[PDB]
């Protein structure tokens, strides 16, 4: 069913899914044979598929130290939200088995996330490149449809992403120095700020904050990126406002005053000249 007369997508039928994007996996190939469908059944009901890597594909998974794994995501075929920004969400209860056995739902970070809520790392029990496998998805009482697709993803590193973050034009001096002259002028002066992060309670080495953030306080790039891998709330550890990792910045003028104080120096007196002295 779809209407014949048309312009664009906007005027179709069924959007694709797409499951919403983390910073710390990327989707780079879909394995085909991988994909079922979860039906509505008042009792127990499961999906299966069988699948034999290619070539190309056993590769990025093979390697000690590679860095791709074989994801499996689930999804509404109906969400509340939108199909294109589908949130990853398996049936409850459920049992996943990769080749007779259960995978436990514990993949990299996402620690916060239940298991309904993010994929399943299949690649530790994928069999020897010649030779089938079978994932088999026993579910029970579902008042919905699910479809799951299977992903050779690559993952994303916390230090990897602190590289875009460096590589992204900083917060200007120029700018620090007028909020922090805004900021002086609301009184009944200086301000003290600290060199430790908030995330760490630890001097910090990448001072950043989003581009977006009202306030002196940085926090430091490489804690919030492993925090975020652990327990993704992309939250400002300061403000609480949400920042998006293109939004990350490092801040230059605290930068230099890092980058210039003594290593047990943890506080920092600012005159509305913009010079600061260590308070020992
Ligand atoms: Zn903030």
Partial sequence: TNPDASSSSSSFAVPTIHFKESPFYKIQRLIPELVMNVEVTGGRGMCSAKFKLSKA??????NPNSKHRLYLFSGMINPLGSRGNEPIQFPFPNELRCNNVQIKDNIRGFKSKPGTAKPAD??????????QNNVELIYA??????????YIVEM???????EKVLQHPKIIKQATLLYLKKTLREDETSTIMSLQCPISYTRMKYPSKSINCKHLQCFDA??????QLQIPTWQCPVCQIDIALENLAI??????????????????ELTSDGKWTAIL
């Fill in 122 to 131: 299949l690649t530790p029990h994928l069999k020897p490149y010649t030779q």
């Fill in 141 to 150: 009482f579902t008042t919905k449809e699910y479809k799951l697709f299977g």
């Fill in 57 to 62: 594909d056993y590769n990025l998974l093979s």
């Fill in 251 to 268: 801040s230059e003028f605290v930068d230099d005053i890092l980058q210039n104080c003594q290593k047990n120096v943890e506080q920092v």
């Fill in 156 to 162: 994303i590193t916390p230090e990897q992403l602190l």
């Fill in 222 to 227: 490489l804690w919030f990126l492993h925090s």
